[PDB]
C-alpha cells in the first residue's frame, strides 16, 4: 500500500545557505548539532550523490539502532534532495521503504520554506501508524532546527 | 488516549486580514469559496464566541454528512482560535473529541504563518488512523487556500 505525508516548515535561513548546510554537509553536521538524535553517518557504498547508501546510527537510547538510506536525486540548483529509507529502523514486516523528498524554496524576504514529502511503501495491506508518521516529521524538524541554530551561532558558516 | 498533530502553513496574506476573513467571517466565506467542501455553517447555540455550537454541513458527496463544533477560545488581538469537533463526522466509537488550535502569526514581510494543532481524544486505547489525521490537515489547507485565493481576487475585502 501507500501513504503520502506532505508537510511544510519555514526557516529564517536563505535557501542556498540552508541547502549547503542541511543537505550537502548534513553527514558532518547532524552528529555535531543533534548528538541526542544522530550518533554517526557513514558511507556504505558511493560518494554522496545519487545511488549512495548511507548508514545513519542513533545514540544509545533508541528503539531503532540505525537505518540505511539511499540517495535518489540531488539538484544543486533548485535545492532538491530525494532519499529513501531502505533498511533498519521502521523498515520490516509492515513497511518496505520510505521515499522522501525535500525541496528548499527561497522566500522574497531571504528565508526559506521547506516542502517535505514522506511516502510510505507499506507491505501489502498494512497501514502506517500515525505515531510513525509523526516520528519521521519530528526527526526532520529536530534536525532542521538544530542546523538553523548552528547557522545563526556561526554567521560565516556555509556562505 | 491522545494523539497530537502540530502543523504549520504559510500565507502571503497578512495575519490581521487573514484572521478577519478565515476565522471571523469563515461561516460566511467557507460555503462561498469552498462549496465542494462545505455546504453550510449554522448556529445551533450561541453567538460565535466561546461556547458557541455550530453545525457544519458537507455537500452531497461525502462519507460524513456534518459535524458539530464548539468554539472554545477566540483572541482577537493575538489571532488565536480554538474549537473542538464534538459530534458527527469522525466522532464516534473510536474518538471522543478533536480539540483544535489555530494561531496566525505575522511575518516581518507582511505575510503569515499558521500554527495549527489537531488533538485527538481517542476513546480508551484506540489509535487515530494516519488517513484521518491527514484528512483533517488537508481540509484545513483546502479552506485556507480557498480563502487566500478569494482575498487576492478581492483586494479590498477585509481591510
UniProtKB/Swiss-Prot annotation, chains A, B:
This is Major pollen allergen Bet v 1-A. Belongs to the BetVI family. GO terms for molecular function: abscisic acid binding; protein phosphatase inhibitor activity; signaling receptor activity. Brassinolide binds at residues 54, 81, 83, 100. Changing residue 28 to T: Slightly reduced interaction with BV16. InterPro entries: Bet_v_I/MLP, Bet_v_I_allergen, Plant_def-hormone_signal, START-like_dom_sf. GO terms for biological process: abscisic acid-activated signaling pathway; defense response. May be a general steroid carrier protein. It is found in: Cytoplasm. One of its GO terms (cellular component) is nucleus. Changing residue 45 to S: Strongly reduced interaction with BV16, hypoallergenic. The lineage of its organism: Eukaryota, Viridiplantae, Streptophyta, Embryophyta, Tracheophyta. Pfam families: Bet_v_1 (PF00407). It comes from the Eukaryota. Keywords: Allergen, Cytoplasm, Pathogenesis-related protein, Plant defense.
Amino acid at each position: 500500500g501507500v501513504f503520502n505525508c506532505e508537510t511544510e516548515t519555514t526557516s529564517v535561513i536563505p535557501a542556498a545557505r540552508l541547502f549547503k548546510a542541511f543537505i550537502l554537509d548534513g553527514d558532518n553536521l547532524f552528529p555535531k548539532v543533534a548528538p541526542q538524535a544522530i550518533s554517526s553517518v557513514e558511507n556504505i557504498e558511493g560518494n554522496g550523490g545519487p545511488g549512495t547508501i548511507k548508514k545513519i546510527s542513533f545514540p544509545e537510547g533508541f528503539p531503532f539502532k540505525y537505518v540505511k538510506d539511499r540517495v535518489d536525486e540531488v539538484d544543486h540548483t533548485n535545492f532538491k534532495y530525494n532519499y529513501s529509507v531502505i533498511e533498519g529502523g521502521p523498515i520490516g514486516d509492515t513497511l518496505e521503504k520510505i521515499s522522501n523528498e525535500i525541496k528548499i524554496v527561497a522566500t522574497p524576504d531571504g528565508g526559506s520554506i521547506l516542502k517535505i514529502s514522506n511516502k510510505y511503501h507499506t507491505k501489502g495491506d498494512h497501514e502506517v501508524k500515525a505515531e510513525q508518521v509523526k516520528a519521521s516529521k519530528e526527526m526532520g524538524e529536530t534536525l532542521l532546527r538544530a542546523v538553523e541554530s548552528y547557522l545563526l551561532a556561526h554567521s560565516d558558516a556555509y556562505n
